[PDB]
Amino acid sequence: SYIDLLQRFRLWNVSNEVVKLSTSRAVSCLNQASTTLHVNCSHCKRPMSSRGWVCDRCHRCASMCAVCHHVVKGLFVWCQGCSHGGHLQHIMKWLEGSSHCPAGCGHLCEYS
Amino acid sequence: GSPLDVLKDERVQYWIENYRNLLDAWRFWHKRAEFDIHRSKLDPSSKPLAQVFVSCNFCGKSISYKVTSCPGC
Amino acid sequence: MFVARSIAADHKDLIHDVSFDFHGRRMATCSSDQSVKVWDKSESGDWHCTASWKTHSGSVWRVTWAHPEFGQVLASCSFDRTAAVWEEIVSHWVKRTTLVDSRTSVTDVKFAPKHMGLMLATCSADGIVRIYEAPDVMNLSQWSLQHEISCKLSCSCISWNPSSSRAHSPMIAVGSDDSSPNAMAKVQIFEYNENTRKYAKAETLMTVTDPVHDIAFAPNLGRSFHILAIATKDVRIFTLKPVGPTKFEIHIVAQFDNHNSQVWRVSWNITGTVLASSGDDGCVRLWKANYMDNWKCTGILK
Ligand SMILES: [Zn+2]
Ligand SMILES: [Zn+2]
Ligand SMILES: [Zn+2]
Ligand SMILES: [Zn+2]
Numbered sequence: 001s002y003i004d005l006l007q008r009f010r011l012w013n014v015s016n017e018v019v020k021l022s023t024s025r026a027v028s029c030l031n032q033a034s035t036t037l038h039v040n041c042s043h044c045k046r047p048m049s050s051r052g053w054v055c056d057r058c059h060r061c062a063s064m065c066a067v068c069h070h071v072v073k074g075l076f077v078w079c080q081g082c083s084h085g086g087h088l089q090h091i092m093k094w095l096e097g098s099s100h101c102p103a104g105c106g107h108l109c110e111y112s
Numbered sequence: 113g114s115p116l117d118v119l120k121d122e123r124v125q126y127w128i129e130n131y132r133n134l135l136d137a138w139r140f141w142h143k144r145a146e147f148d149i150h151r152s153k154l155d156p157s158s159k160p161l162a163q164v165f166v167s168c169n170f171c172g173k174s175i176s177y178k179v180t181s182c183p184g185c
Numbered sequence: 186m187f188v189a190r191s192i193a194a195d196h197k198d199l200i201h202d203v204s205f206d207f208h209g210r211r212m213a214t215c216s217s218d219q220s221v222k223v224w225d226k227s228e229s230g231d232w233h234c235t236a237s238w239k240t241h242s243g244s245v246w247r248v249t250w251a252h253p254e255f256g257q258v259l260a261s262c263s264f265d266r267t268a269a270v271w272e273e274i275v276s277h278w279v280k281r282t283t284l285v286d287s288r289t290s291v292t293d294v295k296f297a298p299k300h301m302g303l304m305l306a307t308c309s310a311d312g313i314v315r316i317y318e319a320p321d322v323m324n325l326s327q328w329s330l331q332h333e334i335s336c337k338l339s340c341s342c343i344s345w346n347p348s349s350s351r352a353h354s355p356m357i358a359v360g361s362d363d364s365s366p367n368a369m370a371k372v373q374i375f376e377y378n379e380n381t382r383k384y385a386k387a388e389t390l391m392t393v394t395d396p397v398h399d400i401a402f403a404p405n406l407g408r409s410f411h412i413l414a415i416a417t418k419d420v421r422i423f424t425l426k427p428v429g430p431t432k433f434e435i436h437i438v439a440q441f442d443n444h445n446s447q448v449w450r451v452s453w454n455i456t457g458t459v460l461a462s463s464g465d466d467g468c469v470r471l472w473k474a475n476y477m478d479n480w481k482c483t484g485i486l487k
């Protein structure tokens with residue numbers, strides 16, 4: 001009931017906080033359901049393991065921000081029409097600055 | 113304004129790649145991004161960076177082109 | 186036109202090297218007290234100290250940096266007959282793999298260019314060059330020594346070829362610091378024939394007769410030929426036009442005696458147009474090229 005009330009007000013931080021520290025098993029399971037992605041390499045089209053940033057057949061490090069050309073080890077944003085992305089903070093600043101895919105391809109990732 | 117024979121040379125690509133690396137050394141990220149827009153719109157042969165795409169758990173295929181529903185199955 | 190300044194840093198013992206990473210925000214200096222330390226330039230232009238730790242039994246001469254794509258590692262050699270690597274964990278560095286396979290003092294350690302992987306080359310006073318490999322960028326606790334090269338002389342310094350055009354096969358330059366009364370080439374170059382899958386002697390510079398202190402390769406930046414500087418009694422610059430090993434058209438371009446001493450260190454810019462040389466005369470002379478394609482000095486600093 002408390003979590004429903006909290007979500008009603010769009011207070012997601014505290015709702016997830018209650019979820020994480022919830023003392024019952026049935027409540028500390030809502031964010032463990034269908035929240036994990038499966039990541040692929042766009043050159044080889046084969047899956048990569050769960051604790052790495054490189055490709056087993058490709059050998060190309062498939063985690064490179066399209067702004068700084070550095071290896072992204074944490075958070076990784078992803079445009080769905082370009083399959084391009086990078087650091088969470090870099091992409092926000094670039095998208096505030098302009099409306100083009102930073103990697104370079106005729107595509108407005110937000111359509112302004 | 114280059115017809116698609118000069119741009120294919122192994123020399124005309126090395127200069128662009130080395131200038132881009134030099135721009136990386138400057139840490140002039142946004143200038144490089146703008147130059148990439150320019151090069152991409154004026155040189156079809158260049159293929160943009162190879163990055164990650166996410167894949168479904170049931171279909172197994174990519175989602176890149178109901179909105180919530182996957183387009184595969 | 187070069188003006189000097191002073192950098193706000195305090196040390197105790199004499200230091201033997203300084204090396205920037207790839208951007209110019211992290212230097213790594215090795216002291217005579219077997220203690221290497223890493224500075225970190227801040228947003229205000231100041232230099233702070235971040236770490237420090239004693240090294241192995243010998244005396245460290247060289248500390249080198251690595252490309253940021255592979256993480257943040259440094260290779261250092263010393264008279265302990267060993268070569269080391271170091272990775273940041275955050276910041277407490279950790280030993281990963283001491284490449285100990287040398288029966289002599291490993292004088293020099295250098296990193297291979299980015300475009301081919303994580304290799305590092307070392308040779309010791311015995312006169313044998315070693316090339317190492319990390320064929321899993323994941324874990325650095327596993328390396329392989331593929332090729333061993335006999336030099337039939339000693340080592341002083343080595344340098345790779347920054348050039349990354351597909352035409353150029355990998356190259357390496359091995360010096361010598363032997364003052365034997367006999368006269369022999371003290372600088373030699375090896376190539377890598379992919380067909381034989383081995384390193385072969387390619388060309389040697391017969392004009393070199395005295396002991397050599399340091400060798401460097403000027404970065405390519407899309408040029409056609411190569412530029413090489415050799416430390417000797419006199420600073421010399423050679424260019425090797427490409428024509429088994431590829432034949433090389435060798436002709437000198439400069440020969441400088443404006444030091445009245447023995448040259449110790451040679452360095453190059455990112456672009457590859459200014460040379461900085463240091464000698465026993467206590468001065469640092471920087472050479473650039475003029476409109477007549479002539480090599481002349483630009484500033485004498487001390
Ligand atoms: Zn791949
Ligand atoms: Zn980034
Ligand atoms: Zn795109
Ligand atoms: Zn997009």
Ligand SMILES: [Zn+2]
Binds near residue numbers: 167172173182
């Ligand atoms: Zn699917």
